[PDB]
């Protein structure tokens, strides 16, 4: 794993804690509305395809906390929908080719009111996720934590059509 950000930012891999700076592009859908679309900014490449293949997963100890209170989200981990206050374990994804491959995730929000949502200040906390990986060879595991950081001054529409 040597993931990099589309703005040129490289992440640390030796330590458990890490920070990523991703801008936001909110929009509204028919049922929910996406807040953070990471399926473009974050994508990774592996090393040595012939001997060692990789797998990455996340556990149930994820939260939405920070400035915003806990809501009911929706996550697409290259498949179906899971609640963002995660109560289960994700299916497995595999990396093998040396070329860059996207890592598709999505972050939604359940509407409570038809008016709107709170504003996001430039530079704050969004969500906390934990990831753990396993190899084709070694039987042990190595887990680490990621926290997303805010880079854009945008708002969240919640329900209805936000008009300004």
């Amino acid at each position: 794993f040597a993931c990099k950000t589309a703005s040129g930012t490289a992440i640390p891999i030796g330590a458990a804690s890490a920070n990523v700076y991703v801008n936001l592009a909110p929009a509204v859908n028919v049922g929910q509305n996406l807040v953070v679309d990471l399926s473009t900014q974050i994508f990774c490449h592996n090393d040595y395809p012939e001997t060692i293949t990789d797998y990455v997963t996340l556990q149930r100890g994820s939260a939405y906390g920070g400035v915003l209170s806990s809501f009911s989200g929706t996550v697409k981990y290259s498949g179906s929908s899971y609640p963002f206050p995660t109560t289960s374990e994700t299916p497995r994804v595999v990396y093998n080719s040396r070329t860059d491959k996207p890592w598709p995730v999505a972050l939604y929000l359940t509407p409570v009111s038809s008016a709107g949502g709170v504003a996001i200040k430039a530079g704050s906390l969004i969500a906390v996720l934990i990831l753990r990986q396993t190899n084709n060879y070694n039987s042990d595991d190595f887990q680490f934590v990621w926290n997303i950081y805010a880079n854009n001054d945008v708002v969240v529409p919640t329900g209805g059509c936000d008009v300004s």
Partner: antibody, heavy 113, light 105 residues
């Protein structure tokens, strides 16, 4: 405290459609997901449904593709379900559960053919 | 992924310890739940994944085990359930339940 209630037993002819209603109160019906567990009379348990009351996108299990519908309603606080195709092998009760694992459960429904 | 368990039927005496275990392959991790079934009631949960006694029972129920082997041991039995014990894993999309074990007392 929160409680779960559901309809009683309903019999149906083979090759038909049946609906079972699960009703909730107390906790917020918008926030929390839905689970379904199939219980044959003394032959273990299976895992079937997984529905969101906010929308209509459902995550099935592999053994059935079109055999279930899993329709959710969000205005009358009544979670629904629909079963398509009826045979002798489907005669078992179905449960209602809330996703915090499987804490609060319902009562059951004797569905026979 | 599969779930097979061994003890099935145990004993009919009051006082001694009992052992219930579930066996799984492909190394499921610390995400296995234990809960019991009564013959005429809805099931209720006992312990969370790994070892964590949940709210709802003040009796002596302690779980242990990690890796691929998981077992349950309790020191005293009296006036408890007649039905069955079920084990539930939380790993992937197709959740599967184990078979049945019956305790008499």
């Amino acid at each position: 405290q929160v409680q779960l209630q559901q309809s009683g037993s309903e019999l149906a002819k083979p090759g038909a459609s049946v609906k079972l209603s699960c009703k909730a109160s107390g906790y917020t019906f918008t926030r929390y997901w839905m689970h379904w567990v199939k219980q044959r009379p003394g032959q273990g348990l299976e895992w079937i449904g997984y529905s969101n009351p906010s929308s209509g996108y459902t995550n099935f299990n592999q053994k059935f593709k079109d055999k279930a519908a899993l329709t959710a309603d969000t205005s009358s606080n009544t979670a629904y379900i629909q079963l398509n195709g009826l045979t002798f092998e489907d005669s078992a009760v179905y449960f209602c559960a809330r996703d915090p694992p499987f804490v609060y459960w319902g009562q059951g429904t004797l569905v026979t053919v | 992924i599969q779930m097979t368990q061994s003890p099935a039927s145990l004993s009919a005496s009051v006082g001694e310890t009992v052992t219930i275990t579930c066996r799984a392959s492909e190394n499921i991790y610390s995400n296995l739940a234990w809960y019991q079934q009564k013959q005429g009631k809805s099931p209720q949960l006992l312990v969370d994944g790994a070892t964590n006694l949940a709210d709802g029972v003040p009796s002596r129920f302690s779980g242990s085990g990690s890796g691929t082997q998981f077992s349950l041991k309790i020191n005293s039995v009296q006036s408890e359930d007649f039905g069955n014990y079920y084990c539930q894993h939380f790993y992937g999309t197709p959740f599967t339940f184990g078979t049945g074990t019956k305790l008499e007392m």
